[PDB]
Amino acid sequence: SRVGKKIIDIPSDVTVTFDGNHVTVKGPKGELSRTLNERMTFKQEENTIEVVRPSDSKEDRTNHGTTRALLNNMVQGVSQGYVKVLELVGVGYRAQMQGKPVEIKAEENITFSVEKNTVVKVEGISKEQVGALASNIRSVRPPEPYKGKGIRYQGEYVRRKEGKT
Amino acid sequence: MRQTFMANESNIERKWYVIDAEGQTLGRLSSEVASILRGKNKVTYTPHVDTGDYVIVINASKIEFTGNKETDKVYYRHSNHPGGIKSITAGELRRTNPERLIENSIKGMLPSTRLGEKQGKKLFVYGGAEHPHAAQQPENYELRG
Amino acid sequence: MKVRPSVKPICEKCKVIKRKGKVMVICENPKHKQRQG
Amino acid sequence: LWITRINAAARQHEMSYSRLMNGLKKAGIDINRKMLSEIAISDEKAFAQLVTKAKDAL
Amino acid sequence: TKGILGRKIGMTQVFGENGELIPVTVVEAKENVVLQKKTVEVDGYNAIQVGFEDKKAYKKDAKSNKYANKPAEGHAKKADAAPKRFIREFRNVDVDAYEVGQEVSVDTFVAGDVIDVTGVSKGKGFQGAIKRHGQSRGPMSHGSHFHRAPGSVGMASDASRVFKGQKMPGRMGGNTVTVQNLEVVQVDTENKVILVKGNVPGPKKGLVEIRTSIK
RNA sequence: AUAUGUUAAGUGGAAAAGGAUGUGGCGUUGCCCAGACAACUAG
RNA sequence: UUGGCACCUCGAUGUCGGCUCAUCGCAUCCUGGGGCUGUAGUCGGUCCCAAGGGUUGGGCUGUUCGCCCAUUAAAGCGGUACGCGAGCUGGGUUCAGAACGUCGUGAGACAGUUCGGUCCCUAUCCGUCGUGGGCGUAGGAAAUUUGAGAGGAGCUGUCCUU
RNA sequence: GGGAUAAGUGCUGAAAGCAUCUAAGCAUGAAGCCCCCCUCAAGAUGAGAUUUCCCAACUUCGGUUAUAAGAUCCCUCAAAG
Numbered sequence: 001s002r003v004g005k006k007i008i009d010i011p012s013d014v015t016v017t018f019d020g021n022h023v024t025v026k027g028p029k030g031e032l033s034r035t036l037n038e039r040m041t042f043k044q045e046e047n048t049i050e051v052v053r054p055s056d057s058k059e060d061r062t063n064h065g066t067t068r069a070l071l072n073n074m075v076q077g078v079s080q081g082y083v084k085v086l087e088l089v090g091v092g093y094r095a096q097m098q099g100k101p102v103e104i105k106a107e108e109n110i111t112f113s114v115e116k117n118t119v120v121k122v123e124g125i126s127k128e129q130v131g132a133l134a135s136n137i138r139s140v141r142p143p144e145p146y147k148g149k150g151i152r153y154q155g156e157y158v159r160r161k162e163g164k165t
Numbered sequence: 166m167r168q169t170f171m172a173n174e175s176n177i178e179r180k181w182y183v184i185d186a187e188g189q190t191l192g193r194l195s196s197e198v199a200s201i202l203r204g205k206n207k208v209t210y211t212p213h214v215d216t217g218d219y220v221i222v223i224n225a226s227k228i229e230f231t232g233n234k235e236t237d238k239v240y241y242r243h244s245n246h247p248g249g250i251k252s253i254t255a256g257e258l259r260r261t262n263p264e265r266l267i268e269n270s271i272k273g274m275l276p277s278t279r280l281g282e283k284q285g286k287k288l289f290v291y292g293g294a295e296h297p298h299a300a301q302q303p304e305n306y307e308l309r310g
Numbered sequence: 311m312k313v314r315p316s317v318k319p320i321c322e323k324c325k326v327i328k329r330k331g332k333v334m335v336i337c338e339n340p341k342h343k344q345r346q347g
Numbered sequence: 348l349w350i351t352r353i354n355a356a357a358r359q360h361e362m363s364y365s366r367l368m369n370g371l372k373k374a375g376i377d378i379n380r381k382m383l384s385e386i387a388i389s390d391e392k393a394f395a396q397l398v399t400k401a402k403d404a405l
Numbered sequence: 406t407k408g409i410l411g412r413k414i415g416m417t418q419v420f421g422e423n424g425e426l427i428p429v430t431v432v433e434a435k436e437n438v439v440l441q442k443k444t445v446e447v448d449g450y451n452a453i454q455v456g457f458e459d460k461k462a463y464k465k466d467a468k469s470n471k472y473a474n475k476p477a478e479g480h481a482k483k484a485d486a487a488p489k490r491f492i493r494e495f496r497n498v499d500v501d502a503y504e505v506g507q508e509v510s511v512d513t514f515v516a517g518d519v520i521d522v523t524g525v526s527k528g529k530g531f532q533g534a535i536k537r538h539g540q541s542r543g544p545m546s547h548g549s550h551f552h553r554a555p556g557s558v559g560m561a562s563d564a565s566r567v568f569k570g571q572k573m574p575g576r577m578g579g580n581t582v583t584v585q586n587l588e589v590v591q592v593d594t595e596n597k598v599i600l601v602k603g604n605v606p607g608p609k610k611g612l613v614e615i616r617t618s619i620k
Numbered sequence: 621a622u623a624u625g626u627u628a629a630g631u632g633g634a635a636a637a638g639g640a641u642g643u644g645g646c647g648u649u650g651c652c653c654a655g656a657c658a659a660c661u662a663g
Numbered sequence: 664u665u666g667g668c669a670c671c672u673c674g675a676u677g678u679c680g681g682c683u684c685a686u687c688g689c690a691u692c693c694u695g696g697g698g699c700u701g702u703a704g705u706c707g708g709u710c711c712c713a714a715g716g717g718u719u720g721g722g723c724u725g726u727u728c729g730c731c732c733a734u735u736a737a738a739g740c741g742g743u744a745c746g747c748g749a750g751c752u753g754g755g756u757u758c759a760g761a762a763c764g765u766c767g768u769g770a771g772a773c774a775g776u777u778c779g780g781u782c783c784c785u786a787u788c789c790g791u792c793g794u795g796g797g798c799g800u801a802g803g804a805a806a807u808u809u810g811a812g813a814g815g816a817g818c819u820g821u822c823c824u825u
Numbered sequence: 826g827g828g829a830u831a832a833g834u835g836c837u838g839a840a841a842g843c844a845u846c847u848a849a850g851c852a853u854g855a856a857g858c859c860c861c862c863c864u865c866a867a868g869a870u871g872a873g874a875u876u877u878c879c880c881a882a883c884u885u886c887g888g889u890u891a892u893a894a895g896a897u898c899c900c901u902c903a904a905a906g
Contacts, residue, residue: 441876441877443876447875447876448875448876449875454877460894464894467894468897469894470894471894472894473894474879474894475878475879475880475893475894475895476878476879476880476893476895477878477879477894478878478879478894479877479878479879480877480878481878482878483877483878488894525904527905528904528905530905530906531906576906578905580866581865581866582865583864583865585864607904608904609904610904611904619863620863
């Protein structure tokens with residue numbers, strides 16, 4: 001909880017439609033229905049964004065500091081588009097058995113049919129969802145320490161060991 | 166043995182009440198209901214006879230707790246079998262069969278005697294807001310906090 | 311991931327925080343990660 | 348038993364046994380607990396007056 | 406789905422494809438007629454009552470469960486059918502593909518269908534602890550006085566009592582058993598019989614219920 | 621019940637060396653719209 | 664665990680190992696998830712989470728002990744009067760007989776070794792496993808709803824397709 | 826197979842203008858798990874349960890009457906004991 005309490009809270013040029021319990025921002029490709037907190041109220045007199053800080057307590061000191069940045073990206077994603085560049089190596093290597101009185105459930109040893117194997121760029125409006133999917137597809141092949149084989153961002157460390165548990 | 170009025174049969178008048186559990190602490194509510202069931206608010210209260218009235222909880226599924234009591238406060242129960250111990254969190258006991266959660270709570274604040282069991286059979290708990298006792302014409306009863 | 315009663319920052323690159331009421335040393339190095347308990 | 352009855356009868360006038368008892372003592376009344384309860388059970392009108400006197404002595 | 410009631414006749418063998426021996430159990434099932442249709446807006450659960458064997462109708466002085474009137478008669482008069490001997494219920498079949506008075510034939514099943522047989526067991530009466538449960542006996546010689554008897558039934562001072570279910574001697578037999586994952590070798594409509602691959606529980610001329618295996 | 625405070629663990633309703641970005645009190649100083657302190661680029 | 668104290672039992676709380684039958688724990692032997700390695704792949708050093716089930720036949724020393732043979736996915740550590748003799752054996756410890764060695768003037772002693780040597784009871788109460796009679800629901804016959812209860816759950820080895 | 830879950834891996838994100846799995850929130854994840862699923866006995870004096878069908882003169886239904894594939898008693902028996 002070591003973050004600058006003071007927030008810029010810049011105005012939003014995109015169209016905004018607050019319904020009290022739920023706030024939706026519809027613009028070029030926004031319209032992201034989301035329910036915020038009802039503790040601290042807002043002061044959206046016009047395009048300029050604003051939120052009130054009632055009670056003034058430890059819980060209100062953080063609650064008011066979260067909503068401010070919680071709507072910042074909300075309207076930011078209604079006009080802009082968060083995109084991440086994912087680099088990796090395309091091979092398909094996955095386990096070993098060779099081939100793709102009874103076998104372990106019919107056939108065995110199946111890798112993945114390489115279809116893309118190129119720098120993928122996710123295009124979304126919600127950073128939260130964008131991050132999830134981005135990491136969800138980045139978990140397919142965790143960056144191995146051998147030669148960094150597998151979906152990743154940039155971080156990588158050379159290694160070659162796996163003999164002790 | 167000078168003179169002391171003693172209540173008995175053909176002298177006791179029992180009425181009906183309808184308490185609402187809308188946003189009320191489990192323990193705080195049960196405590197009040199218990200007294201009414203025993204009839205400790207009557208001027209003709211007698212310990213060797215039943216002079217209490219009938220209570221009817223309407224909501225009960227909107228009952229709330231304090232702190233992390235919905236995650237803790239487990240309810241254990243044995244089945245008289247080697248290793249037959251079952252448990253269930255209060256929060257999970259409020260979603261399914263919430264009427265039993267209030268019953269037990271109010272039944273744990275009554276004496277464990279023959280009269281205590283008969284006095285605990287005058288309590289009716291529900292989950293919605295519609296009770297099938299319109300023939301008894303029960304009136305509302307504000308909780309004297 | 312060491313689990314000892316005493317947890318102190320080994321270097322200045324390691325920072326200490328509190329997650330789920332537990333003192334942990336979220337350090338950059340993977341061999342410098344400790345958790346009290 | 349008497350105390351219990353009095354408490355119930357004294358709670359119908361927005362008051363507590365401890366508060367009522369205190370007031371009565373300050374008023375100067377010397378009625379017994381067995382007599383106070385007996386009155387409340389029967390002549391309830393008479394009991395009402397008693398409470399008023401105790402409420403006037405604060 | 407696909408329920409029926411039949412009687413256990415005996416046990417024989419049938420040669421299948423590639424000259425492979427297959428032990429089967431002859432089950433005769435005829436005169437199957439629906440008697441009622443339990444709904445969810447009148448009972449709270451969908452089900453259908455089915456009869457099995459027939460019997461004689463109206464009779465006066467009759468001190469035997471075979472032929473009379475009144476109670477059973479009336480209930481069987483509701484639908485166009487005669488008094489039944491056995492009656493059961495099925496809450497696994499659809500209650501929209503049947504009609505009060507329909508005749509459940511043995512054409513509903515087809516060779517290669519997995520079914521689950523259900524029925525009561527034979528009965529050996531009062532049995533010992535070496536037969537009821539798989540227990541071992543003590544030395545038969547070497548100056549031993551412990552043969553087909555049970556051992557200890559508890560510990561000592563601590564918890565000085567016997568825990569529920571100490572596996573002691575008692576009556577063992579009449580129990581409802583249900584064999585799962587069976588098979589229908591071949592179905593005959595001429596004699597209205599079904600050939601199940603294996604052996605169902607119960608003695609000869611006993612009541613058995615068949616149902617399509619869920620798994 | 622009244623009046624004022626403390627605690628967020630069910631502490632209350634079991635222990636110690638030690639460990640720790642919990643929190644409230646007291647003190648003693650060092651900077652502060654010449655602009656501290658986040659933010660940040662010169663070797 | 665070996666001990667310290669001497670509070671219950673000397674008008675008796677009568678027994679070491681094995682046999683039969685069990686329950687409970689977790690400081691985890693096997694199977695399941697993970698983390699980090701001065702962690703080549705296989706494989707395993709350590710650490711964390713996890714108790715549901717499963718945990719072998721023989722030879723021998725007197726056996727609780729231990730050593731060996733051959734297996735197994737594994738042959739885990741404990742608690743319950745060092746679980747269990749009104750359920751079993753009597754090998755051990757063991758009582759009157761008799762040898763050997765040391766000790767004693769001798770009767771004899773030895774936490775020395777050896778052969779032989781009677782283990783009593785018709786279940787009243789609670790408890791447990793089965794099975795009926797009597798009433799009660801304001802019911803004569805069938806067919807049932809059921810979450811209250813019990814049981815069962817995750818072991819191996821090949822085949823064969825990037 | 827389904828639902829929450831543990832260690833753990835995360836995604837956003839704030840009471841040091843950075844950071845941070847966290848104080849809100851969104852995920853994922855065990856022979857985990859008692860849950861659900863499967864098998865069996867089961868009306869619960871918290872008199873309870875439910876459905877279908879059958880059964881009337883006495884005589885103020887006092888029971889003077891009584892009826893119901895309504896119960897036995899007794900007799901031939903075994904898929905039961």
